[model samples]
Every structure is written in C-alpha cells, then in structure tokens.
Target chain A: SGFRKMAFPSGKVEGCMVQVTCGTTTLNGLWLDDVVYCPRHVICTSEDMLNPNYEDLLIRKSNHNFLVQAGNVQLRVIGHSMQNCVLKLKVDTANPKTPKYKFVRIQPGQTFSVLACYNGSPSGVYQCAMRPNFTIKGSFLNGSCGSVGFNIDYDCVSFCYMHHMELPTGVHAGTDLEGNFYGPFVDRQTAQAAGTDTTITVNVLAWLYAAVINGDRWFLNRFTTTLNDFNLVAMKYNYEPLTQDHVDILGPLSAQTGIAVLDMCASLKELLQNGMNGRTILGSALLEDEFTPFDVVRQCS
Target chain B: SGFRKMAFPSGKVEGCMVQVTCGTTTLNGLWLDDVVYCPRHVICTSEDMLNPNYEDLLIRKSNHNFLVQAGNVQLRVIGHSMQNCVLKLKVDTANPKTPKYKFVRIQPGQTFSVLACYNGSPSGVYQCAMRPNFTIKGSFLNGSCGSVGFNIDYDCVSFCYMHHMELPTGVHAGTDLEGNFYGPFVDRQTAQAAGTDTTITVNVLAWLYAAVINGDRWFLNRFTTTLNDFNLVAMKYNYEPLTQDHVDILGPLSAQTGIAVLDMCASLKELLQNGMNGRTILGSALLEDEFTPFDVVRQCSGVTF
Candidate 1:
C-alpha cells in the first residue's frame, strides 16, 4: 500500500529519508519530520515518482553551485548556495581553534579547501555544516540549532554533493600532502560531510488527496506549511511562487466528503479551517488579489 | 531485543502494555509517551531489583493500617491525605449538592467513607478526584485536571491505598465524617478503614537506573522531574530530599564511556553537558526558582471527607 512519491520538477523545499523508529518490525512506516520519508529504501528518483508517466520534478536551480572543492578531500554537505546563510567547515576534532577540513566560505561557482593535511594526516575525513541565517533554521543529524531549520543532513564526509539534477558547485578543490586539485576528486559516496542544505518536494494533488482523505488538521497543516515556507523564500529569490491556480476549482470538491467546511471548503476552506494553514491560504489569496477581482476573462475573449 | 523490566518492592509510575505499531504483532513495549521496550515480560517484585543479587526494595511504612473493615458496600476512598493537594469526594457522580457520600472537608487524621446507597439505591462505584493546584498538575489517562495523575484501580472491597510503600496517612479518622459515610460495609477484598492520607515511596537507585541508562535528556529529565515533584511534596512533609549521595564516585565513570560527549559535536554536547540526567545541570540555571530547600515539614496536610 505504499504509494510512489510524486515529483514536482519545480520543487522548492527539499526533504529526505529520516531515521524513524517503529516497533521491532513495524508494518506501518512513518514520515520522520515535516516530509522526511521513512523506511529509507523507497527507490526515490530525482523526478516525481508518483506519476507512472515518470514526470520530472519542477526544479528551480536557483542557479546554485553546491559542489565545492578542497585539498583532495571532497565534501558534499547538504548545502545551500542561495539563502540567508554561509558555509561553515570544521577541519578535524583536533581543536575548535582549528580543523583539518575547513571552508572559510563558498558561494555558488565559488569553492574552498575546507580541509588540509593536519598533524601530518593526509587520509582524514572532511566534515561540513552550514551557518544559516538568524531566521532560517537548518537540521543536522538529530538536533537543530539556529538558522539551521530546513530539513538537512549534518555528517562528516570527504566529498559532498547536491542530490538534484546537474547540481552546481562553488569549486570542489581536491588536495593531499601534494597539491590542491579541483572537482571530481569528491567521491559519489563516503563523503563524511558535516551537512547538506536539502529541500523536500511534494505533489500538490497527492498531498491534497491525503488531506481530503484524512480530513484532519494533520497532513493538511503540514503540507500547507511546507508549501508556504518554500514559496516564501522562492519569491525572495525572484522565482515565480508556486500557486494553486486550481484552488478556485478544486477547493470545493472535498465538501462532498465532509472534510471541508463547505464549497471553497475543500480547497481554500480546507486550508482556512486548518490551523496555521489558513493564514498561509489567506496570504496567497491576497497575493492573488482574490479580494479585488473584476468580472470574466471569458467575456473579453 | 527488549529487556525485561524488574519489579521493585516499591513502584510508583504505573504504565501499560500498549498497542505499539512496531511491525504490528510485535509486543515490544514502550512508555506511552513513546519509548519502546518489551520482555515482553519479567517478574516484577514489590521491591528493588538493584540489590545486586536481586536485593529487596527498601519499604517505607508510614504505618498505614490497611485491610481494616468493610461491609458488602462500604467503600472509603484512599483520599489524598497529603501531597500536592486534597481529594474532593462526591459519593455518586449524580450530584455534589447532597451527601449520601459527600465531604464537608477532612483535615489531617480525619477521614470519610464516601460510598453508599445513593438515589435510594445502595449500589454504585465511587468515582473520586482531587481539586489540583496548577503547579501540582495531575496525570490521568491524558489530561491533567484535578490532583489526579496516576493510573490506579481503586477498589472498595479491599483497602484503598495511596500507591506508595507504607505511605503515610494524615491519620485515618473513624467514620461519622461530618456525614460522609454510606453504611460502613463494602468488602469483597479487605475494605480498610475510613481513610489514610497516602504517600508514595520509590527506590531511588532503581528509579535512577532507568534514568542513567536513558541518559538522553528524555528519561533524564523525566526521572529528575519525577524526583523533583515527589520530593516537592515530601519536603513539605519534613523528609530529607534524595540527593546523589554517590555523585563524587560516579562522576568519573562517564568520562571513560566517551558519552562524556567528547566524541560528538555541539547540540549533542548540550545533552552530555546537561547535568547528570539534566537535574543538576538545569536545576539552578532555570529562570524560575524551582529548587528552594525547606526543613521541618509539618503543616497539617489536607484531606477529603
């Protein structure tokens, strides 16, 4: 009964597989966080899995170059090339005063050497993390600190890369006791990077399908919030905000199911009746200027 | 694999065998708050299991005279003799206005048997609860209203007890409780006296075993919180608070495990650096004054009729 996850080619937020604990051997799998899937092994493709048609996710490159380089050591931390944040690198456990693998900072199409031979050690791992904006929080292994909010992975790895199509890199510099090189030196795996600034994408139709089904405030709220936060940042970057051009049409369908307050209940009402989701709904409503609308587009045509 | 839970002669928190949706039929048990373990079964003794070779739990007898008297219908509630607050009694759920079983109010040593023939019929199970202090939030099922926290079966056939070892009573006052007894006679089990203010006793070491093992802030905070509240009321009654008398010795052991947190970075550091189980660590740093010590606890505990 596990449904294939959908892909919105132009996905805004990023999420991933999380460590979820069920019973010894549980029949039911659960999402770990906002939208982190569980059980880990659900053949997730870069595109929307929900469409048997193999639809591509609505990807907004944000034109971010995530893969950065260093002195031979590669790190593919869950990175954010664009946002209110900076890249933080810790060399090694030697001391806070110093780290073998260190990245002063790396902007898209920019790169640095976050690690180097420290204490005469060349075969050491590179750890990574992001120093997020004061308001934007990010996620690491388990705990999350300030500005580090969105879903992400904080681990130590040699090479870190983004899990998106044709992802970019600041400048992945590679090095050893020898000289520092650039790019491909970062491995596809085993890159014990400190973190990755990842996003989660969901299908509007599939997500709403669950809302119509559960009829509770649970999934409905989470999905709306996910959509809201993603688009909020997206708009800041000048990307077209993802809107439900169909809310006016699809919002009333759920009322027949009683999950909605009424017409406008299924879609907008569903969001409005929901706790925080309602606020976001009204926000987008105002953005759409639904409050100030003239007559028919059809009559003019 | 789950470890079997050992029973101590003294037990306080009552938990249950829940429908944990592990792989479905899996019996792996867990605290409903959401931690799972299952022996699925273990023989729990009424005493401490920490006695290396299965030593008995230290049983504190506030000297409650249990198994006293009762007819086929007299059920004297094990009303709150002391603790956060007092229990309010209503013989029948029907009304508090009248008293077939009602409490005018029972102070220390005074008691009332609040069950009887109600609405002209002498047949009904007494449902009792306590008016609680906000600071003294009680836990029953889900909500914390009334000084009611704890999942217990209060039967009248036998003695109604304040779930604790030899937990003390304000002093069980004989019936005629300003008019709160039905007909001194409900006993399938030994229906003890009118009432005994109850105290809960737990083996400090055994309780901490769970705390120390679940070193993460989760259980650590819970155990400390438990100790805090229990001692909160205990001190009110003049009892010495349970201190880590063994801290000087156990302190260094953690350093060796590396859970000393040197192996990990930040956030987890907060967990490790957080006092042994978060008590001492958070005990003082908190914004509010939660740990102000007291002495000579004797302030006439309250009770219900």
Candidate 2:
C-alpha cells in the first residue's frame, strides 16, 4: 500500500504540516490560490507547479512618481525624454487668486528647473482656472509654441447644471462646492436598485442637463421629441418646445406624477415588447398597477 | 404645455415609430444598446454620442491565416520574415512510415523552393515519429544550422499512461488511440457536479501520471507525502514507495473503502477550516455521513468547481 499520512505540530502551518506518502517520496505542503506551497528545502522546481509562471506575466510592478490633488485625482508623468510632456504639478486650491501657470516654453529637452524658474518669454502664456477647480485651460505650449488646450481632468467636476435641478418626487438633489448639480440619477447603481421614479420629467431633466453641459442640439432636440412622443401616447399634455421653461413647469408635474424615463428612445423597445398598448401606457400604468389583479412588470426606464 | 408621445402605424417598428417634441425640435428615434438608431436624415452627430468612441478600440476585425490540426488545434504563423520561420505543412497520418523532416537548410532569406525541394544536405536528418502522432522530432534545419527539439502540439495528446489506469469504483478510466489514459476527472466541470470519489487512489493516479509524463520527481514525492498524511488520520493504509504495485493493491481497497482526497495537501486547509477533528476525518467519514445529521462539505481538490 503506497499511502502514508503525518502532521507536523511544531512548524509554521502555512509552510509545512500535512504529509503524504505516494511512492518513495513523501511531501509536506499547503495549497493556496491553486498553488501547493512547500518548504524552500523541497525541490519543487522539478514539478509542474499549478501557480502561474511569474516570468510570463505581462505587467510587472514598478515604482513611479505621482501627484495627488483635489477631488482625489492622481496624476503622473512618464517617459525620460521631453519632446512633449506631462509636467508633474498641482492645483493650490487654497491660493485661488494666484496666477496659475499651465506650461513654460522649453528648448526641446529642458528639465523641471527651466520650467519652474522661467524668465518672461513671449512663447509662454499664463493660463489659469476660472475657479480653484481641477481644470486649467492650459496653454501648456508644446515645442517652441503650440496651444495644448483644455488641460482638464473630466473627473474633477460634475457635468450637471449650475442652477437648482428639480427632480421628480422621492428623489433628492444636491450641488457640490464646484457648483455642479446632482440628483438620485447620479447614483444610478443604488438608485436603480431602490427603483426611483423615472418619468418623462426626469428624462427631460437628464436630456436638458446633458444638452446644456455639452451645448449639443442633438441631446436637447432628440429626447425633447421623444418625450413629446410619450406624451402623445398618454395624451395628457400639450406639445411644447425644448425649453428650460418646460423643464420648470414639468419639474412640478414630474413631482405630481413621478414617472422617470432615463432614455425615451432607448427604452422604447423593452417598454413596447413588454406590452405597450392602448389598454395602459402612462406613468400611472407603472405606479397604480399595484391595484391590478395581474402581475406587473416594472423596470427602470 | 409640453410632452407629446406618438405611436406610429405607418412604418417598420425597428426603423421608426416613437416621436417626441422638445424645445424647437422633435425627433423620431428607436433606442437599442443605449444608442438611438434614427434615420440618416436625423443630424444627431451634432452632440456627444453615448456609444463608445469606435476608433479607440484596441482590437479591430481583420482576416487571418490558420491551420486547424488534429484535436481541433488552431495554429497560425504571423509576420513575414525568413531569418527564422514556421513553415506551413501537415502530418499525413495515413502515411505513418513517412520520413518526418523538422527543418531544411537554405540561404538566409530563402523561399519555399529550397525547403520544398530539400536536396540531400549535410545538415538535414530523417527524423520520423515513433507513431502516427501529432508530435514530430523533425530535423527541419533553420537557415544554415541548429536544432529545434520536440515539435509537439500539446493539445493533440494527453500525457496519461498507456496501460490500463484503475481508478476508484466511482470513476471510470479509458485510453485513447494515442495511448493516453483518462478518467471522469478529465471532465472536471461536469464530474464535480456528480461528486464522484476523490480518495488517495485518484490523487496517486493524478500525481504518478503527471510525474511519468513530465519525468518530474516533485509531483511524485510532494503529493506522495501529502497523501500519507491524510492516511495518518484514517490509519487505513500502509506506507509504500512511488510504485505501480501499490496502485494495483489500492485499486480494490480504494473500491471497498472509497475515501477520495484529490489533493491530500491542498484540501487540508478547507478540511480543517470546516471543522476537521478526530471525530470526523476519513474516506468513510465523507461517505455514509448521510447517516449523520450534520451537512457534509465537499469540493474537488485543486479545482474551484
């Protein structure tokens, strides 16, 4: 019989303990993460180890310089050469009024010393943030002179409106110090789980906020038309233009009949395929359906 | 007043149907995968699209050359160069006795002519397979000289033994034409579902087979010691060497007292972590434990499933 078992009570459990006799060789080992960890004294290189080959890993850990700033933004510059560069720097939010420097013109391969101690040069320009925000419209002129515009870390601020955003009832809204508006939708992950109201009002709010920030006509008009189309189905309200005025008026109506449609056109198919008919097709269909006898299918629109 | 929802009776549903009126403009659109699919006439690109920026995709579709070999092995050699090469060819299994050529000596940047019409050369050697198998220890010389040993497509063959592999009672073992032995453990994904026996018998078979194929001593000994440790608790079997005779003896004993321990060393932690005590520890403990009230926990050693 080629079976033997033993336990080592004195040794480190992770290093050695349980032993087994297969043939002639007896092995003491611990298995973790699919790897049988044995003592260094054990000649395991001759075995086919289940652990991944360390040499074959594509990415290896290494040290690097970093700049941690406001809004928990971590920035870093790599590469030894300086043809074009991501200069390591920071935003002094406390010293808001100080002249913010985006970039200092450098001779092809100049170091940080030349950039830090810059003499007044025509090629360089002092570009600063409007507020003590993470974004700086950098004239971080590359080469002798070239505008590297909008040096912004998009994560620094929310894209929602600067004005007070009125969302449908049951949902709360707030504004950050950076003057960006936010609502329950911002936390879509948890909000969707709680099933907050997703009505034409919220969709319009989303559409208008998105359009206002992007200044893009497509988001404003497309969703605006889609919102009206849903209105046509309900036939409860009149046709109106894509305006902030409607956002103001619908903001209340949105509160009254809390129906939230995140994307009118995108959610159309599922809303239809799940049964979109004349029998029931409004915000009330989603809400008051609890009174109905048949089971109701509800999904965040 | 605002908000107008219109259902379309006049068109294809996927193409166009819902319409909305907002501000000065109204849009007709259908949404899928978060992208609003509208007719070409709708100038929607004037805004930032929610869809991913297409040009930024790391991999794009493109045609490729491939060779689907035995055992569904998909092989392809990319890059155009002659410094070193992977020539396209096949193993004519029907012609088992055919001389297999690993490489052919040619000029530095030679074409297929020198390789295809490989004349009698001092460097060339007639290296043929011992059997009609996927591997060919060829003498296909690169450029002027050098050896490319063991031309094997690992997927084409299993490393299990050629002889009859006797597993525990629950597991059925079989052999392929290429002489590789296998068991229910090979189909681990589904086999684990049934929770067949995984005692010292199975672990020994796995460890020995792995060692025999690799000619590696580590797999044989390390697991050998680990298995015996589990046996210490059970006190069912005697100590023995890493020999086939024990496999023969344990074969039936494995059937009578089927206490499966796939990786004796690896499963120890989980076994201990889940209340491993003198009261309950053995192959018999795993089986017939249904006679007890407490639930038994089981996992395929060395596998998540």
Candidate 3:
C-alpha cells in the first residue's frame, strides 16, 4: 500500500562527514547508514523528503525557495543568473548582534564586509556575529569557464565549528524485537507505572501490521483484539500486512491473485473472515521468521 | 589559490550506505569520510563537479542531461514536468541479455512487464535477466498529493541482490606524512625496482599545496629545488603556501592588506619578487602546524576557479 520501512544500523555507528544538497538547500551532516544528522534541527528523513514540517525549525517556505530568517544579519546570493553568482553575508554595525540577511544572486569576484559568526538558535538574529573587520569574497562561475567552480573566503578566527561535534539533536530509538508497545521509560519506576495504567491499550491490528512487515511471528499471540474486528479494520483501511500462508490461500478466491505478502492487503478482509480452518491458520508450530538477506528488502513471498 | 583539501579518515573507515544526487545524476555508493565510491567507474572529484570527464565511463552529455548509453539498455525518466515522473527499467526479452529502456513520464498506477535482472557489467544489456513473468508497477505523485510520493514494486523473486557486499573496487593509498609521491607498490621487490628508476620526480609545488592544506609542516625542508626557483614558480602560478611570517611583512607594503595565510597568493608574486629578508621566510624552526579547528576551511583565501 505504501513504502515499507527497512531497519538499518542507527546509533553508535561510525559516522562520516557528508555534504548533501537538496535543491538549493545544501547542508553538512554526519552520515550513518542511509541517514544524515544535520545541524540546526534540519532532519532529512526517508519517509517524506519535501515535507519540511519537522525538517527544520527556522526554514520558511518562500514560494519555490526557502528563507532562513535571522535578525539584521542577512546571508544571501545576490545575482540574476546562477552562472555567475556571489554569496553575500551582510550585518548592520548598529544592530550587529542579530545578524539577518536575505539570499540574493550576486556577481563573481566581489567582496562583502560582514561579521562571520557561529549561527546558533532558531531566531533570525545571529547573536555570535564575528568581529566587524572580517571581510568575505565570492568567486563563482558555471559556464563562461571550463567547468563549474566556486571559492568562498570568510573569517575563521572569530567563527567556531565545535557545535558540529554533538549532533543528532534528538532520538528516535524504538524497542527490540518483541515489539513493546509501551514506553521505553526513563527508569524502572516509570516502566512499572506505565504497566499499571488501565487506559494503556495496544492496537492489535497495528501490531499485526508491524509484525508481518518485520517478519516476526513470535508476538502473534500477544494480540488483545479479536480476529473478527481485526478483519473489519483490514477491510476498511485496504492496507494490511498479510502472512504468506494467507496470501497463498486467498489468491484464487479473488481475481487479485498474487503479489508480495505485504501487497496482499486488498484481498485480506475475505481471507480473515472464513479463512481459518486448521491449526496452521491460528497458532500451530512456531514458524521461523522470514529472514531477509538484502539490505533493501525487495520481496517477501 | 585554490580549495584547501583536508585529510579525513579514508580507507578501512566503516562505510555507511549513501544515495547522492548531483545535478541530475543520482548514484548509490558507499560513503566514507567526505568521499563516495560509486559504481560503473563514476568518480566524483572535489576538484570539479560539472565536468563529467571522469565521473562515469558511459555518461554522455545530452545538452544538460546526461545519457548513459549501453547498446539499447536505457534507464531514464520521460516527462516535461519533473513534479511527476517514473523511472522505467525495461529489457527486451528478445534481446534480454541487454536490457534497453528509456526514461518516460507515464501516468500513475501503471504496470509494465519486463525481465528483471542482476544488472552487472559496463554493457547496456542486463544479461542475467529474470523470468518474463516479472512485473513492475509504479505509483508517483508530487504537489497534488499533499507531498512528494513515489513507490516502485518490482520483481524480486527471480531477481537477486547479493552483489552489494564487496565495494570500493580500487585503491588510492598514498604514503604516510613523509609524502612519498612514489607508488604504494604491490610487492617489496617492485618497490625496490621503482627505487632504482631515477626518472620519477615528485612535484614540489603540488606536494606543498597538499602539505599546507593538511597542516603537516613536518616535511617543509624536503625540497629538491632552491628558494630562488621555488619563489619563481610561486610568482608564475600566482599561488603558493606561505607562512604567517611572510603575510605579516608583505601586507603593509601593498594596499592589498590581510587575510588567511592561503589567500596571500595574489600578493605572492610581488611578495616572492622581493619576499625573503630573514631565515624566518624560509624554514628555520620545526614550528607547530597551524591546525584548523573546522572541517570546512572558511579561510585560507581559498581561490578556485
């Protein structure tokens, strides 16, 4: 129904330096197994790339381009054609604390005097603006030259890059194989308190979908909901991860015959209604989990 | 003056999987440090980006877009608006050994029957083509669907994915800090034979460029040329790695005042023309290298065209 998520090594892995460019927004980040942890809360997720809803806090949708707002300090490219462009960082001496600048297309071989600073905080102002004497020069050329080239000269004396050491501002750690739908609590007391709560109900259908996709059959018995109700939701949503056993039996019944186990949700409702006859349909033998050999799972049949 | 290339961890570093896109050429590779090792001999150098001279073997310039030609095995996107697109990998069962397909803009929810294969070799054809029953479906939408969306369901049963394990097929190992511009030879005997050959000369300027950028002043005195010839080349190239002492003395002489040590190149020719007065201009002390605190060097008067 949608893209299936594949698990990869996340935390504690050796991260490498990476420079990624998405449209005009280029970012420097620590690259770890198919993911990049960028600075200033700019998260690039595989789930949804263009949805800047959670990507960055300061990025504003300015028509097609994005604008990083900071008080009086403006960092922008000033020019009409991208063939010859100059990036200008301007800061007003009077209000130098809050450096605010806009992106403009500037020309080549141009110099701009601005304060180079360690840009922190979600505010539009650059509070750590460097000394006023710092000068920056840009020399960018795309075509009129042999190849695309650019070099930026900025101040490194006042500016700092130590903030890049502590990256991945937040965490998205999930549970181990057993699929604990409860809290990965802060302490033992918190876990015990969560277990005692009466309203903490787990969605059996959601759990089943996750289990089938993850190829784990060990937790099938942990379902709190009935099979009839599970099948009802499967019919409504039109997207459910069915096991390969069910997929084989249901194919001839409906014209939607065959596909991967994950894509067999369309004919799932009917399969779940009158499908169970033998012990194999329910809890029979402890089947081994369908192991995936490839890093990117192409199929599960 | 040019971009200062820093020395990060290279070989044996735990490589993470990466999918990088530059311009329209998107490649899947193992990323380590700041470099990516891509397939099909596509080498991306930090020295140049738009110049595809060595990026890929099969890539050809088709106006702005690049065309990867392999017989008729074409994998491309076909459409006017990039907002909605489909990546079609087609194979001719008749000529199934070589899968040939073109990029197109097919509507959403479209199914295409093609022979999936273990696409290897530099040739255009997918010789290890899967069964003819292999089916592929694509569902793609952009702005109209609230956000960018795309899903590709293709044949995986008959196909395989075991080739991804061994990667980064070649080697680029250089010498340890001493800057042995000679070969990282295959054998000890071969290294001895290479030592016998006297024609092998190392470029002092290029080695100096890398040395200063790397902040390893340990090999400063290992020069084959004299100070007169060294400064002459510095004046001619209009780029040279000068120490902080030279930058301090030359700034007041000309109106072209001050910047980082690397950017003091333009004032280089004039500075070198009448530059050295004391032993400080040349190597006098085993001074500690001016270590950079940042990954991306914002200064050093980086001038790269």
Candidate 4:
C-alpha cells in the first residue's frame, strides 16, 4: 500500500573499485532516462523529439510533464507516462532514515495525475530560501566580505545573497542557483569597490525551519516512544538530524539572530533519505548480497 | 573524452510526491527482466540460460555478461554489448557533481575490458576505511535468543556478513549491515561489565584524498566538477548538503577520538566549486537547457505544464 521499494545495485560489484550502488546512483541514471532520450549517447532524433507526427518523443518525459500539490497541505499531480506501471507513493513524514512508501497499480494506460521534487515545489525550502524569489529587505549589515561566506542568516525571516551574475536589471536577482549573490570568486577587491557595510536580507525557510521546528519535534521523540503512532504530518519529512549546537559560531552577538550550521543537519536527513547516503566504493560493491543488481550483474543469465 | 552527462530527474519530479526514480525503481523491474521470462510475472526456463543457441537468450545480454577489474589505477570492462552502443564511463573520482562520462563504441558482440570508481585506486579515501570487509578483534560479545540489536562500541572492521533473519542478541544494536562476531551493538550496561574503560577506536578516511586528488587532474571533472575540482568533488555527488561540525562528539565522554565528520572538507574554496555554494533548483533545472530534453518536456505532447 505504501511506496514500493524498487531494488537497485548495492554493496560491492566486480570492478576494481567497489561500487556502492543504491537509489542515488541508479535512480540518478533512471532519472536521466526519464529526462533524456537514452543515457549512453550524444544522439537524439526527430523521432526522439516532440513533434506533431513521426511519433517521436525526445528528452525526459518527466520534467516537461506533470504537476504537484497537497491537501490539508495540498498536492497536485500531472499525468506523464502511459505505461501501466505501479505508482509508488513514498512519503518522508519524519525521520527519512525510516522511510515508508505506498504502492498502487497504474492500470497500464491509466490517465491519472503526477508530481515530483525540489524544483516541483516552489514554496519548498530548497527553492524559497533565496533572493529575487524570497526577497530580503535590509541587514544590521556591516559585515565586511573579506573572504569566504556565511549561511541563510539566523532569520528565515530574510536573507541577502552576496550574488554575482549579470542580469537585465529586469531579473531583479538577489540570488542565483549557486545560492547567495555574485560568484564565490567575487572577492574583496571588486565587492570592496561596490561598497561595504550594506544591509542585505532575504526570507528563507528550509534550514530556518531548523531550531524552532527541531525544538517542537525533539520533545516528541523520546526514542523509546517518539512521533511514531500518528498525526504529525506536515512536520514529518522535516526531521532534524542533529541538535543546533553543531553550527560553528565564530563570535557571538544576538542569540535571537544567530544561526549556526553543521556540515549537514535536517536537510541532510531529507536528502540522504532521498538516497544520497555517503555510500562509497566499498558500500556499492557490498550490495550484491543485499540487493538484486549487484549479483545479477555477475550472473544475469 | 570525458563522461557524457546523462539526463535524469533531479530536485523534484512532477508527480504526486515529486518522486525520484532510478535503478531502485528501475533495476528492480529490469533485474526481474534479466532473470525471468517476463518482468510482469514469475517465470523462467533452462533453455533461456545456456541452452545451445535457441533465440532463448534470457536476461539483459549485459546482465548475463561482463566482467570488472582493477589494474594500475584503471578499470577493465568486459564488454557488455555487441550493439554499436556507446560505452559510457562515469567516474566519481571524488566529485559526483560536474560528472564526466567518456564514451566509446563497442563492437556490439565483443568482449572488452572495463573498470570504474574509487576503489580502483587506494589513493581515494572512500576505500580502505573500516567496518565491512575489515574485522576487528575481540569484544564484550554476547548471544541470546530472538530479536535484533547492536551498539556503536564494536565495529565491523573486516566483517563480510551474508546475513538472513534476526535475533534479540539481547543488547541494543544501533545497526547491522555487517555480520556477527565484531557485533552490531554493545550495550551500555554490559560494556561497563568489561572491567576496563574498553577504549574502542576506529580510524576511517573517506573524503581524505579530496583536495589533493582534485588538484593536478581537476578537468577529469565529469562529476559537476562533482565530488571535486575543489569542494565540488567531495560535495559533488556526495553533495554535503550540510556543514560539518555535526559530527562532533555527543557531549558524553571521550576527550579522545571525537568523531566529527563531514562528507568532505577543504578550504571550502574547493567545494564552493562543488556547486554546494547552493546551486538553485533553477540552476539544476537549467542543466537541461544546456543539454537536451528540457525543452522537450516543455513541448511534450503528453504534458501541459
């Protein structure tokens, strides 16, 4: 009834480098397949493209198609494939580590709905946590940009990207894909010229949903009996990975506005569950014993 | 040539859940196809296997074939296809991002040599680390009836567990992908029973080779500069979505061996290049704009978004 776990390569493989194949690597390939013509080539044809005739379809059938929404929290889906494959519904309600998925038949040619990730959900953390889109107004502001960088600020209330990129003044971009503003290369020399001590701000939520959200959920997880039995829906997939003490605070100021960060935190919990576990070479090769492909690659016949 | 970029669903897809698809969802079905008569149901035949040339070739020709090897830092691929299909090589060499794929034509039905990934070279920290395959000696080990559990004290330095089923080995085990002996768990009450402080120790290195390896051979960047080309290589495919420090000690004991970790770390100069600088979903989405299929999705007769 939940999400069907599609097996992929895992543990070790026969190559010199032990492959830790899992949803990350394998699904990444399939994601490519769903997005492009075929993974192994530089070739695409008219038939592989979208046209009125020739019956050709190209690129990913996924990206260009579909929709997503929610209800109490709403969800929307746009139909993509005609294949009667089972539609698996895996939800990341809490602690992605312990995931749950639901499965149902798609009826081969069933014309149902579809939706999917990061980009698909504009209001989601990954997308909304920036400028232009999230818009930051001002900052206490006098932080000299001598080198390196910082985070989404202590306030999901606002953010200011130290952005670098030429936009048509029309794009009104306070940020770009690589987070903040300007290139990481936009060093002291140039930005110094642009002037310093400017108060930049943005309103982001993803990581900001940290601390507070964590506090509320923390009490619920007594470990022996946490948020397992029921109810905690919207707050589920947002499991916090570690306590807030992890963020390195160079100095201290307003306890209210200081946001510390760990190499990874809650989002890591989400993404890893998304299958980005730091599976190394040894991990991949070892999967042969646990999953289907590893051994199958060795003795497919 | 480098790794040719393959298009796949990323960020979120357009479905009810914004799902992610891959070998997990794919290989399961494909694996089934490679093993049985049809992927729809459970069925197979001996003739489908090695029965003298009836068009009964079962499984993926590639599935029923191929070999992998590691030589002086190179992988040998035992050709999987006889079709004029391209042999694409995607090496994670630290960076899973700016991925590079080198493609070459296989003579369809010829046996060729091939190999890929980190273990191909010990220089890459991902290999040579502990737990699995490696076995640690001695422990306050125990055995009881039923259930399953393990502690973090004992490690699987060289454990090769072909495990099945479970048990209540009594003590609470934190995890159990490895096997028995070294133990998956060590309880707090019993470890105290071991007399001594039982100072357990483990030295592992995964992203250690990151910066150094990322230097001289950076362009080998097929990964998004992926795991490399600075910060990116380790952050590339591994995509350290969080900052480090999260690995710090849990505020208990151990003034020694404070298990702090990050997928990869450097001056951060290297990784911001990993695109960890926070490449927007837009940027991730823009990949199709530079490559292919993106616009195709836009005009897909099947889609109206």
Please name the candidate that would achieve the greatest DockQ relative to the true structure.
4
Name the candidate, 1 or 2, with the larger TM-score value.
1
lDDT of 4 at B263: 22
Structural similarity to truth (TM-score) of each candidate: 0.18, 0.15, 0.18, 0.19
Model 2: residues with Cα > 4 Å off, grouped in runs: A1-196, A200-229, A232-301, B1-305
DockQ of each: 0.02, 0.01, 0.02, 0.03
Question: What RMSD does model 1 have?
Answer: 25.3
Query: Ten-residue segment with the worst summed lDDT in candidate 1 chain B?
Result: B295-304
Return whichever of 1 and 4 wins on TM-score.
4
- Among all windows of 10 consecutive residues in model 3 chain A, the one with the lowest summed lDDT is A122-131
CA lDDT, every model vs. true structure: 0.20, 0.21, 0.23, 0.18
List model 2 lDDT by residue over A105-165, tens digit each.
Answer: 2111111100100011111111111111111112121111111111111112111111111
Give the total clashing residue pairs for model 3. Answer: 32
Task: Please give, for residues B1-305, the per-residue lDDT of candidate 3 as tens digits.
Answer: 22211211111111122332334344432222222223321223333323433323224322224232222343232211111111112212222221121222221111111111111111000111111111111111110010111111111111111111111211111111111211322211111221211100111222233334434333333224344544555546433333344434333322222223333232233334553232221121111122122111222332110
Best by lDDT: 3
How does model 2 fare in lDDT? 0.21
Q: Quick one: RMSD of model 4?
A: 23.9
lDDT of 1 by residue, B216-248 (tens): 233232122333554555456433343443222
Q: Which segments of candidate 1 are over 4 A away from where they belong?
A: A1-136, A139-240, A243-301, B1-24, B29-305
Residue A127 alpha-carbon offset, candidate 4, angstroms: 22
